Design a protein around this ligand. Structure first.
Ligand SMILES: [Cl-]
Ligand SMILES: [Cl-]
Ligand SMILES: [Cl-]
Ligand SMILES: [Cl-]
Ligand SMILES: [Mn+2]
Ligand SMILES: [Mn+2]
Ligand SMILES: [Mn+2]
Ligand SMILES: [Mn+2]
Ligand SMILES: [Mn+2]
Ligand SMILES: [Mn+2]
Ligand SMILES: [Mn+2]
Ligand SMILES: [Mn+2]
Ligand SMILES: [Mn+2]
Ligand SMILES: [Mn+2]
Ligand SMILES: [Mn+2]
Ligand SMILES: [Mn+2]
Ligand SMILES: [Mn+2]
Ligand SMILES: [Mn+2]
Ligand SMILES: [Mn+2]
Ligand SMILES: [Mn+2]
Ligand SMILES: [Mn+2]
Ligand SMILES: [Mn+2]
Ligand SMILES: [Mn+2]
Ligand SMILES: [Mn+2]
Ligand SMILES: [Mn+2]
Ligand SMILES: [Mn+2]
Ligand SMILES: [Mn+2]
Ligand SMILES: [Mn+2]
Ligand SMILES: [Mn+2]
Ligand SMILES: [Mn+2]
Ligand SMILES: [Mn+2]
Ligand SMILES: [Mn+2]
Ligand SMILES: [Mn+2]
Ligand SMILES: [Mn+2]
Ligand SMILES: [Mn+2]
Ligand SMILES: [Mn+2]
Ligand SMILES: [Mn+2]
Lengths: 97, 79, 94, 105, 103, 95, 86, 99
DNA sequence: ATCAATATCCACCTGCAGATACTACCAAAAGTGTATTTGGAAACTGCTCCATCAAAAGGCATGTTCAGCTGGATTCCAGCTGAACATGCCTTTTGATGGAGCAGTTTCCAAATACACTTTTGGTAGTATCTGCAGGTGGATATTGAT
DNA sequence: ATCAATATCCACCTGCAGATACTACCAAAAGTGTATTTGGAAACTGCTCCATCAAAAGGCATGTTCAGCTGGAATCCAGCTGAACATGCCTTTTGATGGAGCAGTTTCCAAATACACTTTTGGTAGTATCTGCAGGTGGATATTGAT
């Protein structure tokens, strides 16, 4: 059977997702996460449709940029595999932790 | 759970858009925590603007103003 | 020309929490700018709040929300409580 | 005649705060309660840092609070540290802190 | 119209009005709204010019968010001006760390 | 009865036709441009405001906007913006 | 009647001074190339703040850079400074 | 057979010493010449209040120290104890000051 | 180098969501004029504090030598993480429907603004007088490092 | 462990930069009372758009297998970078001055604010039309990866 080497399909995905703009997290699961979190600050809250979309657009852009910095941290340690220590390093240096 | 609704595949897609090629098994749980903290800080501020205006509906503007004060200005929703 | 500072007031509060502790001129300058800084941040946030809701008045209510938006966790809870208390006591006069 | 501060039971100047809110042009009108609430919040935050700073000075066997004490007070308190995360206290120095991997044997 | 006198497409009158209501300063000079409207117009043109180019480079006649993202991020100065800004539905620039490439 | 909500959309559209007569723009992209204009307006008016206060002045003139621009816009972008701003005031004053 | 030409002053930020700063920063070992990297980083930092401080000075039509000009320049760069007024 | 502390012992002694104090670590006059040189290249004939120079120095020293903490973390992340230019660059890129 | 398996790209089409067009109505925005009110520019000039210069001298930068131990290069391989698939679970669509609650009006009063006086008070000044603590000793104690 | 070379610690003491004290002055600040104006809380309510349900449709997340190749452990060693030393330079300190230029006090005019009245738009709606390009197909050919 035909089998692509480890890494070859990942490079394809990167090229594929860096070219597109669609959101990469399914909308309903995200909308559920949003509602439960808000419920802890005020109950019986309704959300405009655009309101939830703004939160997804912001969260995804935030996570995407964080992975960029996380990637540099892993590459800095002479790796090509991101790990928790890479995300932590990036957040610490950003001034988030 | 709800945070668990943010799937391994989606998290990998995000990473891919971020230029990541190889991902550690532990990254998925680390990312969920990061995403949860991000949303709590943004949603907390939004709801606060919502409570201030005496509404029971979080508006796009409430989110945009929360993102702006968190230093993460967003364009395209009333900014 | 006269330049105002919060120094005499900072000094009163200091004597209240540490009756036997003094404060260097440099530390006092740090305190005056800390007070000026927090004031600006709270006033600015209140300003925006009023605009967002098309109100032309900044009330204790805007200040309160600015305080919840600006200070973290506990500092907010205590600042908020100390603030409403002082407003309630103020309105119960004359 | 009495001050608005004493009426509010405050050390900080309610008249000055109210006046500074007007001159700043933060809105067209400023309600009577706003300066009272703001003066009290500012008085409280001041009290909180002076409390912690006075203690740092005491731990260093000093009776006079200096910049370094204000810095120790701020950096050692999680919430004040965050409220002042983008602030630099001159002559404050830094918190004694050495990474473990750097210690001998 | 004040805009035509200044040779601008942007609403001088509106800009002036927005400055006063903003409580930016007790008084607003007459030249201020003009200069500001002119600056806003110029920055607008700068971006539409580059985004228009990004759209044609993609064989398209209509400017969408993605084009604005490419215009801004591929420009050193605009990128800086908007370094803390997120353009919704803009995505990111194609970019892969060389150490992750094949062989 | 619906309250009028101002936007820079029509003015943005005009400027688009001068730089690219045959290209259009989606509504979502227009919303972004509108967000952009409002943002810069606020950044500039804000610095202008502070400048006036730092100098014990109560009037925001073209000098405040100009200095505000030098402080906010990076290098070249600032040179040109200052150029456009001055050009528009001289042409406005002598007319 | 005239001053002295100022040049190469960035070398006044000596190797011993940079080591000390690194020490306050928790640094135990320093590579030989750190010293020129640091001077470069400081020069950029200084040009950016001084550029703003002077802009405020010129706006007020003064020829003397005040501590306030520096403080406002640091503030707008997101590096608020307590201790010199404001 | 003179006494010699081992490599690293004096470095640790210095870290504790400097983290315990608050004095400026760069010589004053030299720093002031650097400020005058840079300012002069932006605008000629400028004078400086002495406190303006001191403010610049306190800010610069606070900035460099914090940067070295981050750089130190970048080196340790790479399993080293020796900071190098690549660590300062990684820190500046993540902080959002570089490309 | 050869050859099979997918992935990737370009040309040509179509349906349709999203962008145009025209007409219509109108509360609010702009502009034109006329008056009145002022910020802050132009002068003059008090006097703060910044640039400079001299001198003395000792803290600290320089430039070297020497060798400890860290970074960098290799070698290996255990095992984690990517690729490919069979499964079937639950997100996506949408269309319809209550109906919650956002947003537009109209009413009306507690509260804010505008002014005139009268009473305080915080900021400067000009002189005087304590004091907390930096900085230098001296001697005891805690570390570090060679054996 | 033993023991020596040094750094660290801490009680003691002294000089003085810096912090307190006092008395005066007073422009600006605050508090007090009235008079007049209104921002926006209330009470309704029209209808926009948010939450649910239904119900397939199948797109895409799961759970497995298998093994490629990556991360991390072990070793080895050249030479980079720290510790210590001898020198003597240039920064730090202390004073002394001249006068550049920041900043206070008036005088006074080009503008800005304030109102009235007229005219012009930018939005919001409805209704009818058009069009760039997402989503598919078909067929060509690039890119991978096994031999
Ligand atoms: Cl990890
Ligand atoms: Cl109020
Ligand atoms: Cl003007
Ligand atoms: Cl390097
Ligand atoms: Mn030069
Ligand atoms: Mn073939
Ligand atoms: Mn082809
Ligand atoms: Mn073809
Ligand atoms: Mn005047
Ligand atoms: Mn000396
Ligand atoms: Mn020498
Ligand atoms: Mn050797
Ligand atoms: Mn090693
Ligand atoms: Mn192994
Ligand atoms: Mn297959
Ligand atoms: Mn209802
Ligand atoms: Mn309402
Ligand atoms: Mn008094
Ligand atoms: Mn001592
Ligand atoms: Mn001794
Ligand atoms: Mn003893
Ligand atoms: Mn002394
Ligand atoms: Mn006395
Ligand atoms: Mn009303
Ligand atoms: Mn009612
Ligand atoms: Mn299954
Ligand atoms: Mn194997
Ligand atoms: Mn490897
Ligand atoms: Mn392993
Ligand atoms: Mn080597
Ligand atoms: Mn020795
Ligand atoms: Mn003069
Ligand atoms: Mn005159
Ligand atoms: Mn029209
Ligand atoms: Mn038609
Ligand atoms: Mn297509
Ligand atoms: Mn095909």
């Amino acid at each position: 059977p035909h089998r692509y080497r480890p890494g070859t399909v990942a490079l394809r995905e990167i090229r594929r997702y860096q070219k597109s703009t669609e959101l990469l997290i399914r909308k309903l699961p995200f909308q559920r996460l949003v509602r439960e979190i808000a419920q802890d600050f005020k109950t019986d809250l309704r959300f405009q449709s655009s309101a939830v979309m703004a939160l997804q657009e912001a969260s995804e852009a935030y996570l995407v940029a964080l992975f960029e910095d996380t990637n540099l941290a892993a590459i800095h340690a002479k790796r090509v595999t991101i790990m928790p220590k890479d995300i932590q390093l990036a957040r610490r240096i950003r001034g988030e932790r | 759970d709800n945070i668990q609704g943010i799937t391994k595949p989606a998290i990998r897609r995000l990473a891919r858009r971020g230029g990541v090629k190889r991902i550690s098994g532990l990254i998925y749980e680390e990312t969920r925590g990061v995403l949860k903290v991000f949303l709590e800080n943004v949603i907390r501020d939004a709801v606060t603007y919502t409570e201030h205006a005496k509404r029971k509906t979080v508006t796009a503007m409430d989110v945009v103003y929360a993102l702006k004060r968190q230093g993460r200005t967003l364009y395209g929703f009333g900014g | 020309t006269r330049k105002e500072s919060y120094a005499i007031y900072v000094y009163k509060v200091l004597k209240q929490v540490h009756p036997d502790t003094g404060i260097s001129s440099k530390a006092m300058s740090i305190m005056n700018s800390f007070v000026n800084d927090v004031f600006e941040r709270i006033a600015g946030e209140a300003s925006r709040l009023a605009h967002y809701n098309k109100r032309s008045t900044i009330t204790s209510r805007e200040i309160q929300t600015a305080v919840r938006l600006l200070l973290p966790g506990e500092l907010a809870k205590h600042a908020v409580s100390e603030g409403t208390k002082a407003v309630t006591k103020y309105t119960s006069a004359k | 005649a009495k001050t608005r501060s004493s009426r509010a039971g405050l050390q900080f100047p309610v008249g000055r705060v109210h006046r500074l809110l007007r001159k700043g042009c933060y809105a067209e009108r400023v309600g009577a309660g706003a300066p009272v609430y703001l003066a009290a919040v500012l008085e409280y935050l001041t009290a909180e840092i002076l409390e912690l700073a006075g203690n740092a000075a005491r731990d260093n066997k000093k009776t006079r609070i200096i910049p370094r004490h204000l810095q120790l007070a701020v950096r050692n308190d999680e919430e004040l540290n965050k409220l002042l995360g983008r602030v630099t206290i001159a002559q404050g120095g830094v918190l004694p802190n050495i990474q473990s991997v750097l210690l001998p044997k």
